[PDB]
Symmetry: D5
């Protein structure tokens, strides 16, 4: 894929249409990603404008959601990424993930440098997943796994 976007509004407008069609068909994101060979977090992110789908997956989810030909093509374009309206989320569900950064951001830095060294944990060579588990005290917990490659910073 060599085609890319520069205005996030195009794919994000498509995301809204996808969500409406998805709600009318009573579909889940697991169901949509089923048969694509791709993880639910990757396929979901693509629908929401933050990843590009291969052609085969794009045609599959486009059929499932009744998308027109322009929209199936748009899902394959490399996006202009950035899902937050204005830098800091207002939505409580999204905000809690930002709050984890406000509380543990420097701890993440410190422990990455202690265990790996100078450099970063990648957000590109990177996998994400969300699992629901029982809480032994009652209720449920989300176990969200961030799996990123360590890239070192060395002198040159």
């Amino acid at each position: 894929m060599i085609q890319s976007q520069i205005n996030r509004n195009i794919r994000l407008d498509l995301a809204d249409a996808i969500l409406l069609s998805k709600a009318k068909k009573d579909l889940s994101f697991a169901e949509i990603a089923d048969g694509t060979g791709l993880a639910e977090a990757f396929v979901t992110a693509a629908l929401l404008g933050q990843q590009a789908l291969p052609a085969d997956a794009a045609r599959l989810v486009g059929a499932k959601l009744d998308l027109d030909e322009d929209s199936i093509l748009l899902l394959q374009m490399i996006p202009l990424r950035g899902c937050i309206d204005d830098r800091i989320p207002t939505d409580p569900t999204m905000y809690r993930f930002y709050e984890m950064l406000q509380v543990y951001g420097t701890t993440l830095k410190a422990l990455v440098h202690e265990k790996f060294g100078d450099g970063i944990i990648s957000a590109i060579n990177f996998k994400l997943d969300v699992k629901k588990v029982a809480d032994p005290e009652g209720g449920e917990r989300a176990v969200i796994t961030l799996d990123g490659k360590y890239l070192p910073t060395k002198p040159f």
Copy 2:
């Protein structure tokens, strides 16, 4: 503990002093936390101004770091949390965790509502840890586990 702070600069200035003492003594965060009974991410976060240490743990790390009495008291105080200087990190290592939110924030929201329902994954009833694993294609990866309670949003 019923005492709390309102100006983050006090605990963050202490953090800078802790970090210099820690460097002079060639100490790691894992070995500072050893013997506290507490996870390294929790103890590290406390040193960096973002959690309160129980008294026994505050005295132990204070001994290792040669902290004065006011500093050992300060580590026990409930902090004014917020480790980011100005809302968005400049540091590449912490920025990548912000970028995961810019790319996957809406996917996290969508999958949380899919698997749990309306509501939030807690940043309060919450544990995190960082593990280093080998990348089968070469190098190292960080597996960062966010483990939060689901709190539902229901009508009233």
Copy 3:
């Protein structure tokens, strides 16, 4: 249930249409909510894009307001919450509630930690109500009750 929004403009545009119909029909929020079994503050918030209505209540309020079938479906979706245009309200009526945070925010923090411990008063396990009472000295007062669960922050 499992469907959710990512762009607040969809439900906020619906709220504008809802307010027009409500005004044209000379309806109050109390009487739109009457018969739903849900509190006026919850139903009002849903109309204004900040909560999801159960199917039975969305159908009922949609009949009262002559909403099309897509609008009744949108009311049931889990919203992308955040009602303030740009972080700080300009409207005097909403600004006063922000001002109470500028004046008493640190007092709320201090007294919450004093009475409960480290942690938060939840905005999720949470309800509020607005009550009109007579002022003994003349005129009327609003008694706005914020009722949230204490969630402790514990070492791990």
Copy 4:
């Protein structure tokens, strides 16, 4: 009292000193306010730089906290109010009250206009209290009462 401040840092620096004295003396805000004749939220807000104490209460809390003469006088000055560092709190405890505004701000406006009319609920002719109660489902809740005069907006 006709003396007032223009730079919040003077009283906020004093607040930090008060908090350290309070912690060294193992005092609660309820204990400090006992005997002043004033509500704990009012006295606490004054200590934290957001209200002015009458002379007798200033002298009393200054004895309890072993404050010097300049500090006792500062507590009686009318403050430059505003406790939030930079408009939006970073601290989770304080942030939850902001989130209440992001979710319910327009509902509070709508319900205030429906029950009272055009105008505002006052943040000046206004009392606040925080009450710890049992959660009937288990645990504890905060019942926070905002009690403000209705001021109408009428043509002229």
Copy 5:
């Protein structure tokens, strides 16, 4: 009136249309307010989306400006107030009033507290008028009178 707005763009778009009709009809704000019994500043503010007109005044100004019935209803709605695009005016005429705040804002605070005590001068229980007077040095001056009730901040 119990109906209120949450999106200022609706009444502001109406204001743009009102101003065009006013310009085509060569009308002044003084002429439009004549016969309403309401001050020109109040009626003007309502046209520009910042006040609500009573029904009789809305019908009279609507006849003068040839407004449709939806527009006449909208003028009676309680607005989402806030006339400044983005917090600080760009327009020189409006900016000068902001600059008066930058220069005299702390003086206004200091003199209010000196003459009245702790508290505010209300922007709600409030009247405003603009008068043209001759400058004895040549030219003209505006005398703009801000008339607000004092509301005291008292201990509780």
Copy 6:
């Protein structure tokens, strides 16, 4: 006077010192300005860093407040004006004047152009005063007079 400042912190730091001395001596702004031949609002603004005092008034207020020689010189310097910490006041007393601009800013623009024409009402050739009067409904009111030269905008 040809000397001017470029960093407001110098004169604002002086202002804090002036306020402490003023408080210790139980002085009002009205009596500090007594005998200067200058209006209380002008003298007060100079003490608070927003105007320059002539040498005679600077010595006169400097004696009343027991200011050192450098301070009396500073009060004569042309200031770097701007009393608001960060663009929008947090203090309720100053905020209300900002809110009057949010509600009536466009009304003030419209009425200025109607009565005078294109141009501005000056904040430079400008005087203000604060008067305390009875509220005929009960209580007290402030009548704040803004008196500014009309400067026309003309084609060239």
Copy 7:
């Protein structure tokens, strides 16, 4: 003229239409202003939404650009001024004039107070012109002249 605007987008949308007509007709701003009796900077500013044209000039440039009657009327309206999208220009050509203020802003203040006294150089009683001259070392230079009335700040 007593008619004014409050939303800059109306005249800025007109400016875009003017620019398209001007490009299609191969006209310069000098040619458009020729015959108006007005300086090219003033007429150009009016076309771009920042000044008001007298009626004779409005009709003339309207004929040159084949504008409709609503547009010719809009050009006569007193504008809501402010041509910069979001406070700081992104465009290099416009940014250089902002950079001149970042480098020389305090020097301009200092030199104005030294030559004139306390007060301002007016942006209202003000003329601007752009002159192209040869660079004696090769190339071309712009000599831009800012010609503003000095308005003194005097005690009262």
Copy 8:
């Protein structure tokens, strides 16, 4: 020559010291620059932290102001330029030059491209001066000349 600064606070603190010395010695910027062969705008900007002085000029002005040897050296370093505290000036005298950009910024762009072509008028190959002239209608005017080289933007 080759030494440069990265923190504007160091030279801006030096500027404050220079202004205090200058005020005590009753010096003007014209007299300080006298004998340097450099324009008063250039020397003044250097004192205020926005240009570098040659060694001969730096010792010369340093002797007039009784600067220590570290200060004379600092004046010769290449500065981190930027005199505005926070992007938009609060001071009325400096604000007027920003307002000229809000009013004429796009006119300056349009006339530069008309007279010269695509590209910029330089703020680096650039000179400015401030001249006082008489206003034939009474009073005084400042003529500020901005003189910058045209650098073209050409295809490659």
Copy 9:
């Protein structure tokens, strides 16, 4: 030539249309620029709203992309430049170039002043290109060359 834009949205909307046509036709930027005689970075920048194409190149790329006549004209106008939506990129690919300025911006300043002197490296007399090369350790690298004229800052 002499025509220029003031609202970036016009050319940026055209960019979106170009990208859609480009993807439908399976074209690369390299192929679109082929035959123009112009570098691929310059032509691409023009398509994306940030440069002006000469007439012959505009017609060539217009034919390739099946653009209408208004669009071919628009591509020849001098743009209102600025491709970043809100100052700091959200997109990871664009953000890495901002991060190189956060890490190396003061080093670039320091080394420019050491090797060249006071002044700037031009962004106007400026060429850039992107080259794909083998990584000697495995994989691919981008070698991005910024080639700008040095403009000195000298006294006047």
Copy 10:
């Protein structure tokens, strides 16, 4: 190196001390880096707080600049990176590199995706250098080479 910083001010204050010592000693960055075996851009960045020096290089440059032992240790710690005071540079020399992003940011994205695919050019696996070359039309140019590894974004 497992030690890291969380507050950039510590290393940036050290950078200012380094720059003063460097200026007093008439040293260039090239000669400070000479004998380290490290590139001038890397050593310079470390001195300015944006990289970590290995122990041998830290001791060598510490000797050259007469740094104390705490400072030599600080240069070895992994920094909290971010050299720009407030997100967008004010300094002209630094700003030109930001302007290159405003003009070419979307072109860089487009050409990276065209030549490499989805993903990023690394700012971590990354080197840069600054070279002076003669301009054949007269004067000098800077050739700044940004050399980063391509990291692909692949489906998972």
